[PDB]
C-alpha cells in the first residue's frame, strides 16, 4: 500500500475557546506523481459533510507529494464526542483508506493544579526549575502555558499526560529561569485550560516567599 495516511485531532485550546476554530486534519504522504489524484470524503457520525478544504499539493525532494484536508469542526460537536471519519481514495492503492478520530469517552474530571518550587539542591545552579503538577484530569486533552508580569514565559517544556492509577491523567510542566530572577522574588504563573474547569481556565502562581 504505497501512500500513507494520518488524522490529527484539533488543538486542545481551540476546542475550549469559542473565539477560535478547531479543526481535524487528514495528512496523506507518499502519493505518486504518476497517480496524483487524491479524493477526500468527510463523515460526522456517518453523515457526509462538504465543508472540508484540501490544501494544494506539496511536493518534496522525493517527488512524492503530501496532501492535507482540513475539516473545521464545532467545539460542542467534538466535546460531545462526535466521530470524524476521513475516506481517502487513492488511485495507486486499489483500496480506499478509512480513518476515524474522536475525543476520549468517559466522565470528564477536573484537573488539580499545584506549583512546586525548585529543590534546595538545584539552587547551586545558574538556572532553576519551576515545576507545575496537573493531576486527576480526564480526558487527557489539555493546554498548559507559563507567564510572569503579564508576559508569556516560553522557556518551558511539558510532559505528555500519563495514565494514573485511578484512570485519570497527570502531567508536569517545567519552566526554567535564571536563578537571579527566582531569587529576587518575582512571581510566575502556570495557566491550565481544560474542559472540566470553570471558564475552561485556571491559574496558579509561584514565588520565592
Amino acid at each position: 500500500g504505497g501512500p500513507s495516511v494520518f488524522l490529527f485531532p484539533p488543538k486542545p485550546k481551540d476546542t475550549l475557546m469559542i473565539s477560535r476554530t478547531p479543526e481535524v486534519t487528514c495528512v496523506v504522504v507518499d502519493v505518486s506523481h504518476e497517480d496524483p489524484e487524491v479524493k477526500f470524503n468527510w463523515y460526522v457520525d456517518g453523515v457526509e459533510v462538504h465543508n472540508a478544504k484540501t490544501k494544494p499539493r506539496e511536493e518534496q525532494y522525493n517527488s512524492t507529494y503530501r496532501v492535507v484536508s482540513v475539516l473545521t469542526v464545532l467545539h460542542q460537536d467534538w466535546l460531545n464526542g462526535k466521530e470524524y471519519k476521513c475516506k481517502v481514495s487513492n488511485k495507486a492503492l486499489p483500496a480506499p483508506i478509512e480513518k476515524t478520530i474522536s475525543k476520549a469517552k468517559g466522565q470528564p474530571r477536573e484537573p488539580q493544579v499545584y506549583t512546586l518550587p525548585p529543590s534546595r539542591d538545584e539552587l547551586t545552579k545558574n538556572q532553576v526549575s519551576l515545576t507545575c503538577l496537573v493531576k486527576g484530569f480526564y480526558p487527557s486533552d489539555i493546554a498548559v502555558e507559563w507567564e510572569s508580569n503579564g508576559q508569556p514565559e516560553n522557556n518551558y517544556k511539558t510532559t505528555p499526560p500519563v495514565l494514573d492509577s485511578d484512570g485519570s491523567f497527570f502531567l508536569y510542566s517545567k519552566l526554567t529561569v535564571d536563578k537571579s530572577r527566582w531569587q529576587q522574588g518575582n512571581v510566575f504563573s502556570c495557566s491550565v485550560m481544560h474542559e472540566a474547569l470553570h471558564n475552561h481556565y485556571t491559574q496558579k502562581s509561584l514565588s520565592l516567599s
Binding site: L16, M17, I18, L74, H75, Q76, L79, N80, E195, H200
Partner: peptide
C-alpha cells in the same frame, strides 16, 4: 460555549 448539565452547546 456552555455546558448544560453535561452536554456542551453553543
Amino acid at each position: 460555549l456552555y455546558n448544560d448539565n453535561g452536554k456542551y452547546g453553543a
